[PDB]
Amino acid sequence: SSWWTHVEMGPPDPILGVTEAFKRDTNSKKMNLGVGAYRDDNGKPYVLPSVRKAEAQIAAKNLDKEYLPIGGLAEFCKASAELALGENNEVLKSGRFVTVQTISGTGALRVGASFLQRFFKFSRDVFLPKPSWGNHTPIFRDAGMQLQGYRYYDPKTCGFDFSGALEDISKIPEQSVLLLHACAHNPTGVDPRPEQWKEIASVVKKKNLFAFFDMAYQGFASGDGDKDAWAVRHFIEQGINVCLCQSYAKNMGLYGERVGAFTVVCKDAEEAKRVESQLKILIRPLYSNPPLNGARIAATILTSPDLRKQWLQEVKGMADRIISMRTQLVSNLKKEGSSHNWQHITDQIGMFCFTGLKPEQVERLTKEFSVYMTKDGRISVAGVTSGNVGYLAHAIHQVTK
Amino acid sequence: SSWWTHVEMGPPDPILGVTEAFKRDTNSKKMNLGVGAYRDDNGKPYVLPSVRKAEAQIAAKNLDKEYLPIGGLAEFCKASAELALGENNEVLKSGRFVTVQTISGTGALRVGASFLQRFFKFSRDVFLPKPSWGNHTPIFRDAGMQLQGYRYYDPKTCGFDFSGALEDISKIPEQSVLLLHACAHNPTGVDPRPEQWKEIASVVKKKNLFAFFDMAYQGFASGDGDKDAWAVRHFIEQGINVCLCQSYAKNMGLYGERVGAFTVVCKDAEEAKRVESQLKILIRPLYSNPPLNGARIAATILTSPDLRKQWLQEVKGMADRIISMRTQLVSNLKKEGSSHNWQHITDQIGMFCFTGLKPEQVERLTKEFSVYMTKDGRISVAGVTSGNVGYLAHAIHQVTK
Ligand SMILES: Cc1ncc(COP(=O)(O)O)c(CN)c1O
Ligand SMILES: O=C([O-])CC(=O)C(=O)O
């Protein structure tokens, strides 16, 4: 007597649970360290002025709203590949890549997954770091791939378990897919060092693996676009034919406009044309064609030397404000008398920090102090202000003294 | 070798072929009847003045670009359901529905299809009219459903094969899914009349079929949104709990902004809460959350009485331009001395029209007249103007007399 009587209610959203638990809390000193987007020194959302200026120029052009090609705005695709690999990359010069516009980084992930499902005949397995972005798991499963793990986060140190990572990678059957965060690993903030990368690169090429890069933070991570894109470029120069998911949600503040690109580096231009045609064939039955607004903004910024330069410094200020909060947190933890090693909070990169806090300590931070955060010890460094970091260092010490 | 040596070049897009060949032609009398979007009486893109006003007003509010919920803009969702169902539908008053924002119409079809695949345990079969929108097949297929057909187009009359349709549907296995175009069937332009819809409804309800409405053209079809949604409303009024895909591509000319919605009509609000949570769970691994810009524009128009009233005159405008083209096309065929019955051109509805022309006649139209269209005889009425309709009728009469 109904189509949907057996449809069950989903598990609740832990990250949304906390974000609502915070709005309810009435104490004026409450912090939300669960928020998944950049906030300014006052905890407000931040629309980059280069973005505002791009919108101004765009509006002036009085443009139409006609469909994009299936692969999106050609000029955004070219600029985006350029941002990822550097303008004079051997790959761009010979044309041996295809880049399609996607529905932010998630859509690039899903389009990427769907492409492996269909054309990566060698294996069903996708190896994620332990842990990874939560959504990585259902994206690859819903798309029809098998998930696996390799060691990454060393809880003992709150940094990279280089050696476990490496043993694990050497043991991946050949021609399996390996997923890598290009920088600012999410949720932990723990990234390999350049020398560590070269070694993963070595095994990957040795053991004949497929390197799938997720790059959500180029520039936002360290302030330096080239540094943040270094591992990806290094794999390519090593002769590894990567694919790559870019997001402009964070580094341009374009979250809700859903601006992303998926790229596949190929042996040659003719191969890229074959791959391109099949990405179009997968994309059409997902959503036909991608949205105009974000991509017009990002294209306008990237292809204007002035605006590009200005945006690039606006990114540095975001990256910096975050770094500042990391350094200032450790500072005030010392200044408060704490004894344990907090260098991991500043060794980590990007806006997510695995603190080391265990769950009970997390719960006491919520109860006694109104500091909201996931039981895994992850905080949004974007929730920290200069105005509140002091209080936070006090509170963290209390549950940990 | 390479990861991708076995990846085949995909087949050429035929609609894009027609459109590119049209663009190469240097014949000054050329016509593009392959175009997949509205054009004005000079053959130009048309941004509704209400859309410009809505945009201006949004810009004036200096809004953020933060992430929408997985289900999109709450107020766009509400207004979208009210548009489809009529503001005082008992479905709205009891709250027995869920509506989520999607990546336009295509996105609503894909989300619905994944939901069927995962939850509609009663069937793997989706019945499409013959013919149907080409993308319907890969949509449901990539989502893991199977496709079947029922007789719809009647090639003898270029009309609706009512008795064939009614018979076929009356023999669909109970509890299969039945896809129906709400109005302005694409590609034929052939619609059932109200009385015919009552009979279909009565057979769906007899056989316990699940009705899946694609509604890409409310208001755009006839200029009257209440009449265009009548079938959908009638089905619901008869106790059929439909799902529904909406697009704002054509009726608001938001094509490239990708604004659509998927609705499930449910037994009660409680069931709608359950269905909602599982639509969310399927949306996340697709694209996380939908684009903001078009949804803001649509919510703004729908919830302001002045903008809504203006928008409704603009839709009527487009619909009447299309009806006008249809009428003058038949009229001029008669002035040319054609003796074929051409009333199908005026009986059909919307911007796509099955002319009745054979492939060879289509070839002659392309070669000798530079009139560009697909070989199935389909023309896009949007490419017809006051300027060229006389010419079109002359060409059609030349190749058919
Ligand atoms: C590693 C990673 N990959 C993918 C995403 C998804 O980004 P987007 O919002 O552009 O889909 C994010 C941002 N949450 C991320 O941090
Ligand atoms: O490009 C699209 O979304 C499809 C379309 O209008 C058609 O050809 O009928």
Show the 3-state SS of B268-328. Answer: CHHHHHHHHHHHHHHHHHHHCCCCHHHHHHHHHHHHCHHHHHHHHHHHHHHHHHHHHHHHH
Tokens read off for A161? 């378990």
- Do B86 and B229 meet the contact criterion of CB atoms below 8 Å apart? yes
Looking up tokens 């390479």 gives B2
Please indicate, yes or no, whether residues B334 and B250 belong to a single structural domain of this protein: no
The long-range contacts involving A233-239, CB below 8 angstroms and separated by at least 24 positions, are: A233/A85, A233/A86, A233/A89, A234/A194, A234/A197, A234/A198, A234/A201, A235/A201, A235/A204, A235/A211, A236/A85, A236/A89, A236/A90, A236/A91, A236/A265, A237/A90, A238/A201, A238/A202, A238/A205, A239/A205
In sequence order, which residues have a C-beta less than 8 Å from that of residue B156 and are 6 or more positions away?
A: none
Report the number of secondary-structure helices (H) and strands (E) in chain B: 16, 13
Tokens read off for A357? 């806090």
Within 6 A (CB) of ligand 2 lie A 67, 288; B 15, 36, 186
Tokens read off for B201? 């409804």
Interchain contact A45–B (C-beta under 8 A)? yes
In sequence order, which residues have a C-beta less than 8 Å from that of residue B91 and are 6 or more positions away?
A: B81, B85, B97, B236, B265
Interchain contact A317–B (C-beta under 8 A)? no
* C-alpha–C-alpha distance, residues A68 and A114, integer Å: 21
Residue B379 lies in a domain: yes
- Do A292 and A68 meet the contact criterion of CB atoms below 8 Å apart? yes
In sequence order, which residues have a C-beta less than 8 Å from that of residue A306 and are 6 or more positions away?
A: none
Whole-number CA gyration radius for chain B: 22
Please indicate, yes or no, whether residues B26 and B110 belong to a single structural domain of this protein: no
Please indicate, yes or no, whether residues B234 and B219 belong to a single structural domain of this protein: yes
* C-alpha–C-alpha distance, residues A28 and A303, integer Å: 45
- Do A226 and A88 meet the contact criterion of CB atoms below 8 Å apart? no
| Helix/strand/coil for A238 | coil
Which experimental technique did the depositors report for determining this structure? X-ray
Please give the annotated binding residues of B for substrate, written as ranges. 36, 133, 186, 378
Please indicate, yes or no, whether residues A61 and A40 belong to a single structural domain of this protein: no
Tokens read off for B394? 């002359």
Residue B191 lies in a domain: yes
CATH number of residue B372's parent domain: 3.90.1150.10
Q: From B271, B286, B229, B247, select the one nearest B71 (Cα to Cα).
A: B286
In sequence order, which residues have a C-beta less than 8 Å from that of residue A384 and are 6 or more positions away?
A: A31, A33, A325, A328, A329, A392
CATH number of residue B238's parent domain: 3.40.640.10
* C-alpha–C-alpha distance, residues A397 and B187, integer Å: 68
| CA atoms A285, B104, B113, B170: torsion sign | negative
- Do A315 and A351 meet the contact criterion of CB atoms below 8 Å apart? no
Q: From B400, B401, B393, select the one nearest B329 (Cα to Cα).
A: B393
Nearest Cβ partner for B287 among A106, A274, A285: A106
Residue A236 lies in a domain: yes
- Do B386 and B322 meet the contact criterion of CB atoms below 8 Å apart? no
Please indicate, yes or no, whether residues A307 and A353 belong to a single structural domain of this protein: no
> Phi and psi for B222 in degrees, rounded to 5?
-130, -10
Residue A211 lies in a domain: yes
Tokens read off for A335? 């200044």
Q: What is the DSSP string of B187-247?
A: TT-----HHHHHHHHHHHHHHTPEEEEEES-TTTTTS-HHHHTHHHHHHHHTT---EEEEE
Burial call B135-149: b when 16+ CB within 10 Å, e when fewer: bbbbbbebbebebbe
**Which amino acid is located at B98 in the chain?**
V
Pocket residue to mutate for ligand 2, from B133, B139, B258, B352, most atoms within 8 A of Cβ? B133
B219 CA distance to ligand 2 middle (Å): 18
**Start-to-end C-alpha separation, chain B:** 58
Residue B203 lies in a domain: yes
Chain B from 63 to 92: CB within 8 A of any A CB: 64-68
- How many structural domains comprise chain A? 2
Please indicate, yes or no, whether residues B112 and B146 belong to a single structural domain of this protein: yes
Domain ends where: A319, A340, A361?
A319
B378: which strand partners?
Answer: B354
Sheet holding B97-103, edge to edge: B97-103, B259-265, B243-247, B210-215, B177-181, B125-130, B146-151
Ligand nearest to the CA of A36: 1
* CA B54 centroid distance within chain: 24
Q: What is the dihedral of CA A390, A391, A393, A398, to 10 degrees?
A: 150
- Do B247 and B181 meet the contact criterion of CB atoms below 8 Å apart? no
- Tell which atom from ligand 2 comes closest to the C-alpha of B135: 4
Domain ends where: A302, A319, A336?
A319
Please indicate, yes or no, whether residues A77 and A168 belong to a single structural domain of this protein: yes
Resolution as reported, in Å: 2.4
Looking up tokens 């052939």 gives B190
Residue A268 lies in a domain: yes
Angle at alpha carbon of residue B373, lines to A74 and B9, rounded to 5°: 45
Chain B from 230 to 249: CB within 8 A of any A CB: 241, 249
Residue B373 lies in a domain: yes
Please indicate, yes or no, whether residues B40 and B56 belong to a single structural domain of this protein: no
Please indicate, yes or no, whether residues B143 and B130 belong to a single structural domain of this protein: yes
Tokens read off for A264? 């596949």
Please indicate, yes or no, whether residues A253 and A282 belong to a single structural domain of this protein: yes
B264: which strand partners?
Answer: B98, B243
In sequence order, which residues have a C-beta less than 8 Å from that of residue B346 and are 6 or more positions away?
A: B326, B327, B330
* C-alpha–C-alpha distance, residues A71 and A80, integer Å: 13
B36 CA distance to ligand 2 middle (Å): 5
Tokens read off for B74? 């709450």
Domain ends where: A286, A319, A352?
A319
DSSP secondary structure letter of residue A249: T
Contact across the interface for B255 and A135, Cβ inside 8 Å:
no
Please classify residue B209 by burial: count the beta carbons closer than 10 Å to its beta carbon, then call 0-12 exposed, 13-18 middle and 19+ buried. buried
Q: How far is CA B7 from CA A119, A213, A260, A277, in A?
A: 7, 21, 24, 10
Please indicate, yes or no, whether residues B80 and B33 belong to a single structural domain of this protein: no
Chain B from 347 to 386: CB within 8 A of any A CB: none
Residue A204's domain comprises 47-319
Tokens read off for A12? 């609740």
Q: From B185, B159, B169, select the one nearest B240 (Cα to Cα).
A: B169
- Do B280 and B266 meet the contact criterion of CB atoms below 8 Å apart? no
Please indicate, yes or no, whether residues B303 and B370 belong to a single structural domain of this protein: no
Q: How far is CA B184 from CA A284, A398, B193, B350, in A?
A: 21, 67, 11, 5
Q: How far is CA B338 from CA A209, B199, B364, B372, in A?
A: 67, 36, 17, 21
> Is the bond leading into B155 cis (omega within 30 degrees of zero)?
no
Looking up tokens 């975050």 gives A322
Residue B1 lies in a domain: no
- CB atoms near residue A336 (< 10 Å): 15
